[PDB]
Every structure is written in structure tokens, then in C-alpha cells.
Design a protein around this ligand. Structure first.
Ligand SMILES: Nc1ncnc2c1ncn2[C@@H]1O[C@H](COP(=O)(O)OP(=O)(O)O)[C@@H](O)[C@H]1O
Ligand SMILES: Nc1ncnc2c1ncn2[C@@H]1O[C@H](COP(=O)(O)OP(=O)(O)O)[C@@H](O)[C@H]1O
Lengths: 745, 225, 225
């Protein structure tokens, strides 16, 4: 039977498209756009339109949420298809809204929702179908009650749409096309994939695990900053697989009186036991099971021990999976981590720029944002926000945009009109205004993400580029050639040279090329855990680096400890040596299975402790020389990307005349020239505006604002006020140390 | 805006007429225009004399007094509460079936009341329609303000105990239970137990008088472009 | 599902049968099948003529009516909730002893009723068996749903206070609360104190058809050869 397939989520959001594989469509003699009849479980049928796809396999069929709900199936099921290309054009269709969706709308729904939806699509429908339409600020579901001819018809420009009558009652077969699901999560693809796999295995076919005889997981621990969407992940999994999600709240349990708390918890577990394969979610685990030293009373110990006993009391029976959410995975009692209890940990990190863009795309789906906003800019300027903050931002922007329309809906009625909703649009000004008075909550959090700097941003330095490519890319991209034949890859590279030559840029560039996470630990924080704080921080720094492998750990200004050590204090040298002991101790503890790369940068190479300079640690040395050749011209292009022009001030002459300068100096020159251009443009605008105050609109020839047109004079004036930061002594010291490194050893 | 007006108007037609009659008859009966003796369904009078005066009024005239007002009001409330729910329950269309059920129950109850020596033909009919509604709407849990989660198919027995301990004349409630059970067996249980043809069938005369409501379309619009 | 069926079947056969008779006989009398005039336990008629109907019919038929069914319901609930407790308490292994106690109580109550001038010999038996249950189940707290608790072995006094204010027939229950104490003395108090008079001996002609509970053993089959 080359008919049955497997259902999976689709990437196109239309309600009448299912994606096959080209070989399967070719075998079934079906062409693009041909109508099909899809039949699923419970003897429910629906009609749909097929299309082409890129990477879908032969046995997989892609469809969105509406079609899956209509067929009354779930993910991972099977369907039987049938090509039925004899659809007859319809004549009259009766469609009615559902009761619990149109509360306070009134108006005429046909002219607002149905007409744009049913135009130039020829959407096939079938009697009893349910479809969802996005409107002003809500999503309204419409149910087809009857058609002609029955039961298949195609909407055509000549039809008799009846949309009159009372709304119909929601039935008890379809759960809802409005609750959470896999299409309501963004920026967490990898972790969602892991959880989906690990929970789809037991919750679908328990008998397979019974017959095989392996041990399914009995506990999953999710940890991350608050407001990143953990409860939502658990709810989505439970509502998609099919279960009896039963939330338990930590403060609710602790708020009881003495002996009834553990009794309530016991009824919770026994109920979830005898209600079929279910998921138990414990929110705010640290609120009820903190570290032993934190507790001072006695009821806390009793509650913790009761939880542990009930956890150990689960042995097979119904496959009940326990999930728990905690803020930071060290306040939990260490007793709750042995095998047979919470053992598998999944991290839910703060989203990056793409994650924020996707969250904004998800949350503003109902709105009717005007064709002037740019979500990319708002996405990439809001670093430091979490999902909840972005949702609040969208809500506030909508509220602000609707505030300045009270005149149109003055009093009106308790049921707001319909066309006023379609009269509302949200512009960039509203989003910026909501941005202004908004405070994020991440801030002081380590950021892990793939840097966007590419190879062209760096000018010159070919040999260093090749050496980094050899040392980093080869051991990972072809691990077979390294497991065969016994080569031990290096664990670290140390950068040294004149200051401001682009060490951070090289590190970020190789991190981007390798497509690996990047973690930067800068000098100020390093000295912050040096004095005042303790050295326990390095432990979780290395742990976080290990968690997100592969990664490129970066230690900047490694010589700060020695620079502060040598002076007239002589009290904290112990702290510096503790920093070095921590770095060395967790540096040697790394294993070769994981790919963690350590890179250090410094500008006083002769002052670093010789303990680090040793096989098994940071051992290769790379010397980045002072810039030369028309690679500084490429540098100038790198920061002149966005800057408009240069006309006739030949940059090659500047490169010829500016020998012995680092990158920071050239970037300073470019910024100074741009500042002069801004000053000139602003003074010209002010001259024009104070001139227009005398002659009213006396402008025969129309000139717009002066287009950014940087001349040579600005650049020459900026160049006059320029010097060289690095003296001639430092380069000679560096070359002396290089020669000593070459000869002495 | 008379709430009583549209409240009455929204009632289904046959329930509307029945409620109007069962409220209107007692008022005139207590006014004194017609003596109670004219309306009791006297068995020997009906058998010997044709007495076309009392084939119908036995279910409309009720001697309300300060000894049975609570029973009267609670029965009227039960009628109002469950007759409409049965009307909207699986009986939204084809009212002829409901009317035939009512008329058959009326004929059989009148015949058996002639067989016994009973007078007031209201309680058995109301309780029997409640019983058949509960039986067709079984397995669902519903109760009163203090009744937590009482299950269905038990209310008839509860009201039996109530009106037996508080009141009397349990014979007519018993015969209401039997007539409801036999009608359920004949209309529903028999055609699926043995597959026999429907012994009871609605004649086309009632369909002529009471056509079943079909799907209505109203007026719509052309999609155009 | 037949919840009522399993609820009835869970009751022991003797208790179930007796409860069913005591709840069905009054309904039969009320339905008019038999005139109640023959069911009053006439003292003079029973003394003159044997009239075998009366000694058995006076223990079951209750002319329940408005204003008097509360006592019927409360004693029925007490019967149902306290008969099985004593049945499985200490006489589960010897149901013949329980039946013999019931027979002795019936004989005493009918003898006194013929001697005295009461007609309904049901409530005294119920309150006497409640008294003997309380005496055999002393030292606990009395359930009281809408309030606090109480102390055991005071159940007969509570019943005496309850049935005195509501209705009457205080003499009947006063007489009834003597046979239980007499049996407690003879069967229980006498043997440990004197043990001389051993007239209380259950015969065997009922042992033949009333064996003990035993290991039950279910049923078996003969393997044969
Ligand atoms: N893709 C997403 N990632 C993170 N948060 C989201 C996402 N989509 C929506 N949210 C918002 O995040 C909130 C999740 O609740 P949250 O406070 O994270 O639970 P918890 O208190 O367990 O952390 C929801 O209110 C939801 O509006
Ligand atoms: N190929 C290059 N050579 C030198 N400098 C460059 C090059 N490409 C970019 N730059 C500039 O050098 C700066 C990098 O400085 P950075 O490396 O952060 O200072 P430090 O070397 O003290 O860490 C960037 O602002 C960038 O504009």
C-alpha cells in the first residue's frame, strides 16, 4: 500500500495546502494544484490542495493546524489519501460563527472577514468543516453547516454566501483551534526538538516500551531565567501528544496549613496516576525544595522528604513523566539529582536576534501593522529582553495605537463596531514610544550567541586566518580523519601584539565561520571576581561553556591581574593566583569528547605567568603585526559600508601616507569625518529653516534636504587633527620578545 | 419592553399553547364562572352519557388551594424547565413526533383513568415527559443548589419519594412511570432490539398541519471580486 | 449499569429480604390492593379467633401519611445503616443465632402487644435492636452531621427523646427497650455472673438449612476416574 503517509507540521500557513514529495506525487499521477480527498481516523474526510516541497521525505506529508484538527488526528499518525478531481462549483454556502469567539462584535461579518478570505483562492470546502480567520484584533472560527451541491464545492466569484443567524454552540469533539501548540513557540528550535523526541517516545506507544524492556525517563528538569516560556513548553507538549497535564503550584502547596500540604501533594500524584498517561508539572521547584542550609524550620524538611519518597515510589505502571521548572540549577536540593529522579537537564536560554524577530512575528499575527514598520530593526535593537517582555511591548503598542482614536468610538456601544477595527493600523512611532518607557529584565546576564562578523570585515592577516582555520576547523569538520590516526588537537591559542589591532574581531570571525557559540569574559568582570567576590564563579562559567558545546571561550586582557598585582598594594596577589588556579584547574579537566576552544588575548606577553605556557594548556603563540599594505583600505571599507561615499579623496593615498597606524586610529578618523559631515548638514538645515521664516514659501526650484555628500575637505580637516597611538618603542619590544621566543627556547 | 411578552414569544409553539392553557384554566376556574362539578371526568357519567364536556378539561382544571399550591408551582416549574429542554434536545425539527407522543400519552392516560377512578390528569403526564427526557438524556450529572453531583435517571425516584411522603395518591405517578417506560420501549428499544417496523407512525395529516421545519437560507450576497 | 441492583445484592440475604418486605408491604397496603382494616393487630379479635394474619402483618404494614413519614424514613435509615453493622459484628459466623434473637424479640413483642393496647409492633423492635447494638458497641462518639459529637451507649436515650416530642407512642418504645436488656442479661450478663440457667439453646432443625459462613470454598467439581 503506497498510500499511507505520516503527518508532520507544515511551513506554509495557508488552510488549504498539503505538501507532498515530488516522487510520491509523480507516482500518484497528481500534478501541481490538483484537488485531493484526504481521509483520516474517526471516518472524517476533508478536501485540500497539494503543492511542491523542498526537503520533505516520501512518507511525510505537511499540514498546518486547521487541517489536522478537521481530520481529527495528531502528530505522528497516518492518513490515507485519494485523488478525487471531480469537484463541482458551489451555488450557496451557509457559514456561522462560534459562540465563544464573537462576544461583542456585532456588525456585518461578511464585508470584513469572509470577502477577503474567499477571494482569488478557490478554497475547496466540505460540509462540517471548521476554519479560522484572522481579523482586526481577534481570530474568529467559522463552521460550514451546509452546502450545495453536497458535500463538495468550490467557492467561485458567483456564489450565494449566507452568513445570517444565531451563532452555533461549540461541540465536544474538537478541543479548540485557539490554545497553545508547536506553532506558538519561537527561538527554541533545538531544545524543543530534544524535549519533543524524549517525550514522544513513551507517551505515544507504552506497549512498545513494555515489550522491549528499556527504562523510560522518569524526570525532566527545565531551568532558565524567569519569563522565558517553560510552562508554555510543557503545556504545548502535553496538549499536542495527548495527555492529562496537571499543574502543581509551589506557593499553593506551601500556603496550606501544616499537615494538609503533603496530603494535597499525595492526592495530586495518585490522581495523575489514575488518569492515564499524564504529565505532572511542578512550578517554582526551588520555592518548596531549596538547599538544606537555607531551610530553618521543620515543615520544609517534611515536605522535601515527602516529595522524595513519592518520587521514588514510581516504578513502571502508567508512564507518568514528571517535569519541574527552576530558576538557576544550583538552589535545588542536591538530593534531587540521583538516578531514578530528576536527572536529565535541558537549558532554555535567552533568545538571540533571530529568536526575538520570531517572537515578534508570532505575537503580532492578529494585528494589522501598516506597510511601513520594519520588524528587523525593532528585533535587533531590543537585546536583553525575554519573551514576556516582547509580548508586553506588543500589547502596549496596540493599546497606544488604539488610544488616539477615541473620537471615532466615542461612547458607541458596549459592543464595539467592526469596521473601526479594520480602520486601525500600528506604525513605527507607536512601537518606538512603547520602547521608550520599557525596562528589560535580563541585563546582567551572560550572552551566548553566534557573532555576525564575517571574513570580509577583517582586512589583511592572511597567515593568521589560515592558521586559525587549520587549528579549529579541521579537528571538528572531519573528526573521522582525527579519530583515525592518533592526533591530539590543541586546546588553546594565545594572541599577543600591539593593542587595538583586532584580536576580538578575529575571535568573533572564526566563531562565526565555525558556526559555534561565542562566550566573552572581559577584564572588568574578571577583576570583579578577583577582589570582593570569590572564585566559585569560574565553575559555572566553565559549566555553561560545556553545556552549549561547541563553543569558543574568550578571555580578554588576561594580563590585568598582573598589571594590578605590580604596584604599591601587595595584598591581593593571592586573589590573582586564585584566578589562575581556577583557570588552570578547570582548563585541565576538559575532555577531548567535547569541542571547547579557549582563546586568550593580551598585550604584555612577557608578564604572564609561565605556568599557562605549557603543553596541555595555552601553548601556540600567534603574533599579529602592525598593519600595512592596502589592507587598511579594506579596513576603511569595513566601517565605510554604511557610510555613503568618499568621492575623490583617494583612499589609496591615505593608506600610503598613514603607515604605522592601528585599526582603532583609522576608525577614529572615519568617525571624526562623519561628525564633521553631520555638523555641516545640521548647520545648513538650521540656516534654511531660519531663512524660510522671512520669505513665505518663496522657492521656485524644489530642493530636498542635502543628500549625504561627504567631500574631501572634511576628511582633510579631520586628518589634520590626527596622531599615532602606538609609539615606536612597543613594536620594538614586541619584536625583541618574538626574537627571544624564536631563539632562547 | 415587556419581558413577559418576548419571554412568552420565544417559547416553542406547542409548549407555549400548553403553558398558556395550564395557566389560564385555573384562574377562571377559581373566578367562579364555571362550577368545579362540571369538570372532573366522571367515569360512570362518561360511560353511560357521552358527556362531550369532559374529555379534555381533566388535564387543565386544577383546584388550587392553600394545601397544594407548592405542588402546583413546583410541577409548573418542572414543566417549564424540562419541556423546552426536550424541545431543543434532539427535537429541534419534526415537531409532529413530539405532538404525537403527547397525544398518544393523553389517549392512553385517559383510557386508563377511565379504567380506574382517578380525577386529575396532570401529574402523570408531566412526570412521564420528565422521565422520558431524563432517560433519553441519561448518564449526565445534574442536581439542585445543594445537590453536588447527583447522576441522572434518579430524579423520578426522588420526586416519587417526595410526593409520596409529602402528599399521596402515588398510583398516578406509578402509572406515569409505566407509560413512560413502555413508550420508550416501543419507540426506541423495540426497533433496535428486534428490527421490527415502527408500530407507531405519524400520519401525513399531521405533517400537512405541522410540517417539519427545513433549513432556511435567508438572503445572502454574491462574492464577486 | 444497575447500581441499585448491586447495592441491594451487597446486603445479606436475611437483612435484604426483611428490609424489602418492610418497605413493600406499606406500599401494597396504600395502593388499595388490600383493605387496611384487616391489618391492625386487633387484641380482642386475636384473643377470640386465631386470625393468623395479624401476628405477622402488624410488624410490616405502616399507614404512612403526611406529617408522619419523617419517623418512617428516619427509622428506615437507622435500620439500613445499623443492621449490617451488627450482622457482621459478632454474629456473622452464626447467622442462626441472629435469627433466633429476632424470633425471640418477635415473640416477646407480640405477647406484650396482645397483653397491651398498641397496634404497630415495628418501632419497638427497631429501637430495641438499636439499643442492643449500642450496648455491644459502646465507647465511641455519636455522629452528628451539622455539629459536634457525643458519647456512645446513649443511643436509646437519644431515640427516646426524639420519638417522644415528635408524635408520641412513648409507652410502646418504653416496652421495647426491655427485651433487648433482658436478652443482654440472659445471653451475655448471666453466663459470666451465674451461668446456671441455660435455657437459651438454639435448636438444629434450622441448623440443617442454615450452615455457618465457613471457608466458603465456593463450588467444585468431581474429578472422577
Ligand atoms: N516563544 C516564546 N518564548 C518565550 N516566551 C513566550 C513565547 N511565546 C509567548 N511567550 C510568553 O511567555 C510567557 C510564558 O510564561 P512564563 O512566565 O515564561 O512561565 P514561567 O513563569 O514558568 O517561566 C507567556 O505568557 C507567553 O505570553
Ligand atoms: N584588519 C584589521 N586590522 C586592524 N584593525 C581592524 C581590522 N578590521 C577592523 N579593525 C578595527 O579594529 C577594531 C578592533 O579593536 P579591538 O580588537 O576590540 O581592540 P583590542 O585589540 O584592544 O581588543 C575595530 O573597531 C575595527 O573597526
Amino acid at each position: 500500500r503506497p498510500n499511507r503517509l505520516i503527518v508532520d507540521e507544515a511551513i506554509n500557513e495557508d488552510n488549504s495546502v498539503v505538501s507532498l514529495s515530488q516522487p510520491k506525487m509523480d507516482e500518484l499521477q497528481l500534478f501541481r494544484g490538483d484537488t485531493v480527498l484526504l481521509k483520516g481516523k474517526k471516518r472524517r474526510e476533508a478536501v485540500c490542495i497539494v503543492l511542491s516541497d523542498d526537503t520533505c521525505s516520501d512518507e511525510k506529508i505537511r499540514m498546518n493546524r486547521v487541517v489536522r484538527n478537521n481530520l481529527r488526528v495528531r502528530l505522528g499518525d497516518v492518513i490515507s489519501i485519494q485523488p478525487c478531481p471531480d469537484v463541482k462549483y458551489g451555488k450557496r454556502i451557509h457559514v456561522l460563527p462560534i459562540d465563544d469567539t464573537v462576544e461583542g462584535i456585532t456588525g456585518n461579518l461578511f464585508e470584513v472577514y469572509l470577502k477577503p478570505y474567499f477571494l482569488e483562492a478557490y478554497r475547496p470546502i466540505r460540509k462540517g468543516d471548521i476554519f479560522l480567520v484572522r481579523g482586526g484584533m481577534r481570530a474568529v472560527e467559522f463552521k460550514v453547516v451546509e452546502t450545495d451541491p453536497s458535500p463538495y464545492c468550490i467557492v467561485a466569484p458567483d456564489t450565494v454566501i449566507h452568513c445570517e443567524g444565531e451563532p452555533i454552540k461549540r461541540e465536544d469533539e474538537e478541543e479548540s483551534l485557539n490554545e497553545v501548540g508547536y506553532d506558538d513557540i519561537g527561538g527554541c528550535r533545538k531544545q524543543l526538538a530534544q524535549i519533543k523526541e524524549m517525550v514522544e517516545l513513551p507517551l505515544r506507544h507504552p506497549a512498545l516500551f513494555k515489550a522491549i524492556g528499556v527504562k523510560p525517563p522518569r524526570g525532566i528538569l527545565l531551568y532558565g531565567p524567569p519569563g522565558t516560556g517553560k510552562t508554555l513548553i510543557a503545556r504545548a507538549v502535553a496538549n499536542e501528544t495527548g495527555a492529562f497535564f496537571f499543574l502543581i503550584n509551589g506557593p499553593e502547596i506551601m500556603s496550606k496549613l501544616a499537615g494538609e500540604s503533603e496530603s494535597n501533594l499525595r492526592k495530586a500524584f495518585e490522581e495523575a496516576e489514575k488518569n492515564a498517561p499524564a504529565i505532572i508539572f511542578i512550578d517554582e521547584l526551588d520555592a518548596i525544595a531549596p538547599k538544606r542550609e537555607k531551610t530553618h524550620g521543620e515543615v520544609e524538611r517534611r515536605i522535601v522528604s515527602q516529595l522524595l519518597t513519592l518520587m521514588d515510589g514510581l516504578k513502571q505502571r502508567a508512564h507518568v513523566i514528571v517535569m519541574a521548572a527552576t530558576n538557576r540549577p544550583n538552589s535545588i536540593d542536591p538530593a534531587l539529582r540521583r538516578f531514578g529522579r530528576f536527572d536529565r537537564e535541558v537549558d532554555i536560554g535567552i533568545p538571540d536576534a533571530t529568536g526575538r524577530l520570531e517572537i515578534l512575528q508570532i505575537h503580532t499575527k492578529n494585528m494589522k501593522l501598516a506597510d511601513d514598520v520594519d520588524l528587523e530593526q525593532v528585533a535587533n535593537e531590543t537585546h536583553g529582553h525575554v519573551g514576556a517582555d516582547l509580548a508586553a511591548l506588543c500589547s502596549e503598542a496596540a493599546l497606544q495605537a488604539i488610544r488616539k482614536k477615541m473620537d471615532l468610538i466615542d461612547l458607541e456601544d458596549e459592543t464595539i463596531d467592526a469596521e473601526v477595527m479594520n480602520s486601525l493600523a500600528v506604525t513605527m512611532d507607536d512601537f518606538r514610544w512603547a520602547l521608550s518607557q520599557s525596562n528589560p529584565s535580563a541585563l546582567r546576564e551572560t550572552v551566548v550567541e553566534v557573532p555576525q562578523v564575517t571574513w570580509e570585515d577583517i582586512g589583511g592577516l592572511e597567515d593568521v586566518k589560515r592558521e586559525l582555520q587549520e587549528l579549529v576547523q579541521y579537528p571538528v569538520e572531519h573528526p573521522d580523519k582525527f579519530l583515525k590516526f592518533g592526533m591530539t588537537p590543541s586546546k588553546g591559542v594565545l594572541f599577543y601584539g600591539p593593542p587595538g589591532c583586532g584580536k576580538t574581531l578575529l575571535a568573533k570571525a572564526i566563531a562565526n565561520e565555525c558556526q559555534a557559540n561565542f562566550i566573552s569574559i572581559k577584564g572588568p568582570e574578571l577583576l570583579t571576581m578577583w577582589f570582593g567576590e570569590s572564585e566559585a564563579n569560574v565553575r559555572e562559567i566553565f559549566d555553561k561553556a560545556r553545556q552549549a558545546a561547541p563553543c569558543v571561550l574568550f578571555f580578554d586582557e588576561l594580563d590585568s591581574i598582573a598589571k594590578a598585582r605590580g604596584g604599591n598594594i601587595g595584598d591581593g596577589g593571592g586573589a590573582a593566583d586564585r584566578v589562575i588556579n581556577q583557570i588552570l584547574t578547570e582548563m585541565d579537566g576538559m575532555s577531548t569528547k567535547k569541542n571547547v576552544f579557549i582563546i586568550g588575548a593580551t598585550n604584555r606577553p612577557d608578564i604572564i605567568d609561565p605556568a599557562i605556557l605549557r603543553p596541555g594548556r595555552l601553548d601556540q603563540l600567534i603574533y599579529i603585526p602592525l598593519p600595512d599594505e592596502k589592507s587598511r583600505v579594506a579596513i576603511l571599507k569595513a566601517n565605510l559600508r554604511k557610510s555613503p561615499v568618499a568621492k575623490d579623496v583617494d583612499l589609496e593615498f591615505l593608506a600610503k601616507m598613514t603607515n604605522g597606524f592601528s585599526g582603532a586610529d583609522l576608525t577614529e578618523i572615519c568617525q571624526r569625518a562623519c561628525k564633521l559631515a553631520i555638523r555641516e548638514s545640521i548647520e545648513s538645515e538650521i540656516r534654511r529653516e531660519r531663512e524660510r521664516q522671512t520669505n513665505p514659501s518663496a522657492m521656485e526650484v524644489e530642493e530636498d534636504d542635502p543628500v549625504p555628500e561627504i567631500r574631501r575637505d572634511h576628511f582633510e580637516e579631520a586628518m589634520r587633527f590626527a596622531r599615532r597611538s602606538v609609539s615606536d618603542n612597543d613594536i620594538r619590544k614586541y619584536e625583541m620578545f618574538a626574537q627571544t621566543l624564536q631563539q632562547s627556547r | 419592553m415587556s419581558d413577559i411578552g418576548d419571554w412568552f414569544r420565544s417559547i416553542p409553539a406547542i409548549t407555549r399553547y400548553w403553558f398558556a392553557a395550564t395557566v389560564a384554566v385555573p384562574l377562571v376556574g377559581k373566578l367562579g364562572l364555571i362550577s368545579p362539578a362540571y369538570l372532573f371526568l366522571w367515569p360512570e357519567a362518561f360511560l353511560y352519557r357521552f358527556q362531550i364536556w369532559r374529555p379534555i378539561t381533566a388535564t387543565f382544571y386544577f383546584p388550587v388551594g392553600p394545601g397544594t399550591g407548592f405542588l402546583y408551582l413546583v410541577n409548573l416549574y418542572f414543566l417549564y424547565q424540562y419541556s423546552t429542554r426536550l424541545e431543543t434536545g434532539a427535537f429541534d425539527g419534526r415537531p409532529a413526533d413530539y405532538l404525537f407522543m403527547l397525544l398518544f400519552n393523553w389517549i392512553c392516560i385517559v383510557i386508563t383513568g377511565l379504567a380506574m377512578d382517578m380525577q386529575l390528569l396532570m401529574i402523570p403526564l408531566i412526570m412521564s415527559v420528565l422521565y422520558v427526557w431524563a432517560q433519553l438524556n441519561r448518564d449526565m450529572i445534574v442536581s439542585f443548589w445543594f445537590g453536588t453531583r447527583f447522576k441522572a435517571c434518579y430524579l423520578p425516584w426522588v420526586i416519587l419519594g417526595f410526593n409520596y411522603i409529602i402528599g399521596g395518591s402515588v398510583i398516578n405517578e406509578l402509572i406515569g412511570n409505566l407509560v413512560g417506560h413502555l413508550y420508550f420501549f416501543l419507540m426506541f428499544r423495540y426497533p433496535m432490539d428486534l428490527g421490527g417496523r415502527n408500530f407507531l407512525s405519524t400520519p401525513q395529516f399531521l405533517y400537512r398541519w405541522l410540517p417539519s421545519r427545513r433549513h432556511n437560507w435567508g438572503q445572502g450576497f454574491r462574492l464577486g471580486d
